[PDB]
Amino acid sequence: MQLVLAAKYIGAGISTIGLLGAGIGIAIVFAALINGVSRNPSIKDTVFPMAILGFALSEATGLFCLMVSFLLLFG
Amino acid sequence: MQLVLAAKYIGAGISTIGLLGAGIGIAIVFAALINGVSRNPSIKDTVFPMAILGFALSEATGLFCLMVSFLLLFG
Amino acid sequence: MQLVLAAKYIGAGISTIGLLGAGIGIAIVFAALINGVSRNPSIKDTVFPMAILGFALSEATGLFCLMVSFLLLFG
Amino acid sequence: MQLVLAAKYIGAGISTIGLLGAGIGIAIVFAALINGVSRNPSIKDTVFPMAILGFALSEATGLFCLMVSFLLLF
Amino acid sequence: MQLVLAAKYIGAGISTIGLLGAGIGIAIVFAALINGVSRNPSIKDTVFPMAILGFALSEATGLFCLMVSFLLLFG
Amino acid sequence: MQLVLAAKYIGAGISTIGLLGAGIGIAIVFAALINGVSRNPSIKDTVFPMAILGFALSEATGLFCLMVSFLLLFG
Amino acid sequence: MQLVLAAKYIGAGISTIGLLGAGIGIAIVFAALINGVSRNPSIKDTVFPMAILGFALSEATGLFCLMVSFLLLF
Amino acid sequence: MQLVLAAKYIGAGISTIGLLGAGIGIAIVFAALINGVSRNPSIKDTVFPMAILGFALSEATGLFCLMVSFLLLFG
Amino acid sequence: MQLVLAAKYIGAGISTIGLLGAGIGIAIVFAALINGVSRNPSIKDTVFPMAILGFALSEATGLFCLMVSFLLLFG
Amino acid sequence: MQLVLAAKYIGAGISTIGLLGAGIGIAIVFAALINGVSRNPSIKDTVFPMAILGFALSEATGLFCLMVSFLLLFG
Ligand SMILES: CC[C@H]1/C=C/C=C/C[C@@H](C)[C@H](O)[C@@](C)(O)C(=O)[C@@H](C)[C@H](O)[C@@H](C)C(=O)[C@@H](C)[C@H](O)[C@@H](C)/C=C/C(=O)O[C@@H]2[C@H](C)[C@H](CC1)O[C@]1(CC[C@H](C)[C@H](C[C@@H](C)O)O1)[C@H]2C
Ligand SMILES: CC[C@H]1/C=C/C=C/C[C@@H](C)[C@H](O)[C@@](C)(O)C(=O)[C@@H](C)[C@H](O)[C@@H](C)C(=O)[C@@H](C)[C@H](O)[C@@H](C)/C=C/C(=O)O[C@@H]2[C@H](C)[C@H](CC1)O[C@]1(CC[C@H](C)[C@H](C[C@@H](C)O)O1)[C@H]2C
Ligand SMILES: CC[C@H]1/C=C/C=C/C[C@@H](C)[C@H](O)[C@@](C)(O)C(=O)[C@@H](C)[C@H](O)[C@@H](C)C(=O)[C@@H](C)[C@H](O)[C@@H](C)/C=C/C(=O)O[C@@H]2[C@H](C)[C@H](CC1)O[C@]1(CC[C@H](C)[C@H](C[C@@H](C)O)O1)[C@H]2C
Numbered sequence: 001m002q003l004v005l006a007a008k009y010i011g012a013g014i015s016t017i018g019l020l021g022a023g024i025g026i027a028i029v030f031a032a033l034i035n036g037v038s039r040n041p042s043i044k045d046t047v048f049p050m051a052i053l054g055f056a057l058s059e060a061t062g063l064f065c066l067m068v069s070f071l072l073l074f075g
Numbered sequence: 076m077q078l079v080l081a082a083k084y085i086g087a088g089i090s091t092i093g094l095l096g097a098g099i100g101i102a103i104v105f106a107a108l109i110n111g112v113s114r115n116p117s118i119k120d121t122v123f124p125m126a127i128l129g130f131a132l133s134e135a136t137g138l139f140c141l142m143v144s145f146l147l148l149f150g
Numbered sequence: 151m152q153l154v155l156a157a158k159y160i161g162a163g164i165s166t167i168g169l170l171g172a173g174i175g176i177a178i179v180f181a182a183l184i185n186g187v188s189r190n191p192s193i194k195d196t197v198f199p200m201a202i203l204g205f206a207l208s209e210a211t212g213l214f215c216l217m218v219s220f221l222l223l224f225g
Numbered sequence: 226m227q228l229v230l231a232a233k234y235i236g237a238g239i240s241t242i243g244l245l246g247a248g249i250g251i252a253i254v255f256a257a258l259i260n261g262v263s264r265n266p267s268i269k270d271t272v273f274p275m276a277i278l279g280f281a282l283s284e285a286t287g288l289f290c291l292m293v294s295f296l297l298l299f
Numbered sequence: 300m301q302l303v304l305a306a307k308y309i310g311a312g313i314s315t316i317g318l319l320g321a322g323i324g325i326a327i328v329f330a331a332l333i334n335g336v337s338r339n340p341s342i343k344d345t346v347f348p349m350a351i352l353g354f355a356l357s358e359a360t361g362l363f364c365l366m367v368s369f370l371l372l373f374g
Numbered sequence: 375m376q377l378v379l380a381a382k383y384i385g386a387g388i389s390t391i392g393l394l395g396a397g398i399g400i401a402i403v404f405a406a407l408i409n410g411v412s413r414n415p416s417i418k419d420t421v422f423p424m425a426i427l428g429f430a431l432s433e434a435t436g437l438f439c440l441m442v443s444f445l446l447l448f449g
Numbered sequence: 450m451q452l453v454l455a456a457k458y459i460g461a462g463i464s465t466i467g468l469l470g471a472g473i474g475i476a477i478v479f480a481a482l483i484n485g486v487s488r489n490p491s492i493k494d495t496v497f498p499m500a501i502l503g504f505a506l507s508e509a510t511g512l513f514c515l516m517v518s519f520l521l522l523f
Numbered sequence: 524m525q526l527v528l529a530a531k532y533i534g535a536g537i538s539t540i541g542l543l544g545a546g547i548g549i550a551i552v553f554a555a556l557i558n559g560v561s562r563n564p565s566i567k568d569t570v571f572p573m574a575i576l577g578f579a580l581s582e583a584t585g586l587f588c589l590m591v592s593f594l595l596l597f598g
Numbered sequence: 599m600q601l602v603l604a605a606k607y608i609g610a611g612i613s614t615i616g617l618l619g620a621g622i623g624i625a626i627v628f629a630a631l632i633n634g635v636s637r638n639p640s641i642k643d644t645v646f647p648m649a650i651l652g653f654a655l656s657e658a659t660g661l662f663c664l665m666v667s668f669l670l671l672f673g
Numbered sequence: 674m675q676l677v678l679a680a681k682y683i684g685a686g687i688s689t690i691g692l693l694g695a696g697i698g699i700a701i702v703f704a705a706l707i708n709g710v711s712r713n714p715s716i717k718d719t720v721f722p723m724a725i726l727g728f729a730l731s732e733a734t735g736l737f738c739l740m741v742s743f744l745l746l747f748g
């Protein structure tokens with residue numbers, strides 16, 4: 001049971017690597033929001049909800065990674 | 076038995092790394108949606124369904140990773 | 151047998167990493183479809199089949215990764 | 226117990242890798258802000274809060290990594 | 300020979316990582332095809348064979364990865 | 375306690391990987407500063423403080439990585 | 450001897466990772482060819498040999514990886 | 524002591540990975556300098572100092588990686 | 599001396615990872631050659647030698663990786 | 674002694690990974706040089722020295738990696 005515990009803790013740390021995807025992705029979505037509004041200010045109210053949706057869906061991939069991390073840590 | 080359980084848990088952690096691809100990919104699709112709408116607002120109803128399609132197909136790759144993760148954790 | 155089984159499960163997890171390629175690639179294809187359509191709406195029926203071909207070929211690289219994962223998991 | 230402790234320390238190191246996402250992502254948001262403002266200075270006051278929101282959400286992904294790190298360390 | 304069989308299985312999993320290159324590359328080619336056709340529809344018949352060639356060559360890098368994987372699994 | 379000291383040292387090495395994010399990110403910010411100033415020299419005094427802020431925030435992610443590294447080395 | 454053999458097989462797998470560079474790089478060259486030809490069709494005959502040279506040199510880096518793989522396997 | 528020494532040397536090698544960040548980042552800065560100068564030669568004396576600042580800050584992230592490497596090698 | 603031999607062979611394989619840098623980099627240089635000539639055909643004789651120099655310098659990083667690989671394999 | 678030598682050799686292999694950053698970075702600089710000259714041939718003598726500077730500074734990061742590699746291999 002020492003080796004299995006050890007494996008849970010190493011696995012937990014490994015499971016956070018994938019959060020780099022949401023880190024970069026969320027930024028990509030907001031960068032597009034900024035560039036799109038700068039080029040066409042009147043489009044703000046249209047694309048802002050699209051940026052929020054894009055953020056949420058990219059963020060979810062990070063949520064799945066952290067869930068596994070917490071399952072290994074505590075579950 | 077200790078060695079096998081340990082391996083399953085390390086394996087489950089490793090299995091989440093691939094989710095970074097969907098994290099970035101989902102964002103790439105939404106960035107294109109936002110930049111496309113900003114450049115040509117009249118195209119919104121045409122490209123929005125393409126963004127949903129793209130997100131879903133990109134998300135599927137992350138779901139396959141999570142499937143293996145859960146099979147290792149629980150199966 | 152314990153060490154061999156352990157290696158199968160670690161290998162199965164490692165085998166999912168490559169799916170990040172399709173996660174990003176599927177999105178790159180759909181981003182191009184969206185931007186091409188935004189710039190030239192009249193071309194949509196011509197490029198849509200190209201995007202479907204492109205995403206399918208990109209996805210298949212990840213499915214081969216998953217194939218090896220399942221062979222390791224269940225073989 | 227020494228094997229478990231060893232693993233916590235290895236795991237704590239591994240858990241910082243994901244911070245590279247925030248490092249890059251924060252910069253992506255600021256690059257868009259700078260280029261957007263350069264192209265259309267009048268839009269600055271509109272896009273700056275969008276930049277604040279974007280970098281904060283990108284940064285938080287890294288804070289989640291660090292939280293697992295600190296859990297393993299302490 | 301627990302050790303050698305274990306190594307074949309871990310090696311086979313690792314051998315699939317490289318497939319991410321074809322996943323992204325195939326997409327890059329098709330993205331260019333889509334963007335090139337949208338900007339200049341008359342060029343379609345010229346660039347489409349170029350995109351098939353690009354796909355095949357990128358794909359070949361993933362084929363080699365899978366070849367080593369199967370040699371480790373079955374060879 | 376060969377094992378625990380060894381783990382602190384391997385962990386400390388691994389903890390520096392994340393610094394690559396600030397390496398790339400800091401550069402991305404300064405690239406935008408340079409391109410923005412070249413395209414619109416009159417905007418320099420506006421965007422320069424933005425680039426300093428961007429650098430600091432990206433840099434902070436590398437600081438956290440180094441903090442964990444030093445905690446593992448000396449803490 | 451079993452430990453050495455094990456290592457050769459692990460090493461052979463590791464040696465294919467670098468092929469991802471060629472996978473991406475071959476595609477980068479073809480993307481430029483397609484976009485260059487789309488923008489200026491008259492240039493096709495000039496840039497096509499440049500594309501052949503570029504992808505071949507990119508591809509060779511992957512062949513070097515595979516050579517080490519095969520050395521370890523056989 | 525053998526295992527601790529072994530871990531120092533493996534750690535020292537791992538500690539160099541992060542230098543890839545500065546390798547790419549230094550180049551991103553200089554690419555921006557070149558393109559900004561090509562588009563607006565008159566701006567060169569203004570942006571050159573920015574590129575030097577940018578590259579130095581990017582490089583330093585890699586130098587911290589190298590610092591940890593040497594501490595592990597020679598400490 | 600079994601463990602040291604084993605380490606040489608694993609190290610040799612690890613030392614080829616860095617060749618992915620030249621793979622992507624060489625392509626980047628040739629992509630620029632192609633795009634630059636397409637946009638300005640008269641510049642071909644000027645930029646072609648620059649692409650050859652760029653190729654060689656990027657290629658050298660791959661040479662250093664393969665040298666270490668061959669030193670571990672045979673030296 | 675076996676364990677320490679083994680570690681040095683694995684370490685030396687790991688130490689070359691960072692060279693990928695210079696491999697990509699050197700190429701990014703030369704691509705900018707080529708695109709800059711193509712857009713504005715008269716700027717060649719100004720930007721060529723900037724490309725040499727950028728390449729050398731990016732290459733230095735790869736040299737630091739190789740330094741650690743050789744110290745492990747031979748020192
Ligand atoms: C996958 C679904 C995601 C939901 C998206 C919802 C989008 C709708 C949209 C309108 C949001 O509500 C939002 C833009 O207003 C929003 O994010 C706010 C709630 C949020 O307060 C935002 C405006 C901020 O100011 C924010 C930067 C906060 O200051 C910061 C402390 C929080 C960062 C953060 O990442 O929080 C997460 C995030 C919201 C995520 C987002 C989850 O949720 C939290 C709580 C639940 C779990 C723990 C997740 C885990 C994480 C790894 O995904 O973290 C939650 C802890
Ligand atoms: C190809 C499969 C994917 C399906 C895509 C379908 C696209 C159609 C499109 C119309 C969607 O339904 C959508 C845009 O309306 C949509 O995502 C809604 C369901 C959703 O309510 C949306 C509007 C949101 O508000 C959404 C951002 C939520 O706030 C947020 C909490 C959900 C994030 C998320 O990633 O959800 C996933 C996703 C839908 C994924 C979707 C998977 O499903 C969930 C629930 C089921 C299981 C648990 C999956 C596992 C995952 C790893 O694939 O996760 C599920 C957990
Ligand atoms: C390096 C050689 C590559 C060949 C390229 C040939 C290009 C010519 C071009 C005209 C093709 O024939 C094509 C575009 O028409 C084509 O690919 C068709 C065969 C294909 O049917 C296409 C129209 C599709 O619709 C396709 C998306 C299929 O629906 C889908 C089920 C197949 C995806 C796929 O990746 O298949 C691969 C691929 C063709 C690859 C292609 C390999 O082949 C398969 C079978 C052989 C091995 C197992 C490879 C492994 C892969 C990882 O390289 O996978 C083969 C299994």
Ligand SMILES: CC[C@H]1/C=C/C=C/C[C@@H](C)[C@H](O)[C@@](C)(O)C(=O)[C@@H](C)[C@H](O)[C@@H](C)C(=O)[C@@H](C)[C@H](O)[C@@H](C)/C=C/C(=O)O[C@@H]2[C@H](C)[C@H](CC1)O[C@]1(CC[C@H](C)[C@H](C[C@@H](C)O)O1)[C@H]2C
Pocket residue numbers: 426429430431433434436437440576579580583584587
């Ligand atoms: C998260 C907070 C960051 C602070 C940002 C502050 C921004 C304000 C801005 C006006 C700065 O002060 C600055 C641009 O003037 C500036 O950085 C100067 C201090 C600096 O002297 C600058 C002009 C330089 O010329 C600089 C390139 C130096 O010549 C060079 C030797 C230092 C590089 C470097 O990375 O230093 C770091 C950095 C400032 C970082 C910056 C950290 O600080 C140092 C010391 C503290 C720790 C050890 C960090 C670790 C690093 C990995 O984050 O490294 C510190 C060691």
Ligand SMILES: CC[C@H]1/C=C/C=C/C[C@@H](C)[C@H](O)[C@@](C)(O)C(=O)[C@@H](C)[C@H](O)[C@@H](C)C(=O)[C@@H](C)[C@H](O)[C@@H](C)/C=C/C(=O)O[C@@H]2[C@H](C)[C@H](CC1)O[C@]1(CC[C@H](C)[C@H](C[C@@H](C)O)O1)[C@H]2C
Pocket residue numbers: 502505506509510513650653654655657658659660661664
């Ligand atoms: C770091 C210095 C690099 C030198 C660059 C020189 C540039 C000058 C320029 C005029 C060249 O000579 C060139 C463009 O004409 C050129 O590369 C030719 C020699 C080359 O034949 C080219 C035109 C091809 O047709 C080429 C695609 C061949 O068909 C292909 C079989 C060779 C691929 C290859 O990567 O070869 C390498 C390369 C030249 C590399 C290039 C080495 O050299 C070889 C032989 C020496 C060692 C073994 C290297 C190791 C490699 C990992 O760097 O591989 C050598 C084995």
Ligand SMILES: CC[C@H]1/C=C/C=C/C[C@@H](C)[C@H](O)[C@@](C)(O)C(=O)[C@@H](C)[C@H](O)[C@@H](C)C(=O)[C@@H](C)[C@H](O)[C@@H](C)/C=C/C(=O)O[C@@H]2[C@H](C)[C@H](CC1)O[C@]1(CC[C@H](C)[C@H](C[C@@H](C)O)O1)[C@H]2C
Pocket residue numbers: 651654655658659662725729730732733735736737739
């Ligand atoms: C900041 C340090 C870097 C120095 C940059 C200097 C730039 C100035 C600029 C004018 C150069 O000298 C140069 C462009 O003229 C140049 O590279 C020449 C020396 C070179 O002859 C050039 C014209 C070439 O033809 C060159 C492409 C050769 O064909 C090719 C065989 C060399 C590739 C190469 O990477 O060389 C390196 C590099 C110069 C590196 C340069 C390192 O040096 C070599 C020899 C010395 C040691 C062994 C280093 C180790 C490396 C890991 O840093 O490798 C050396 C092995």
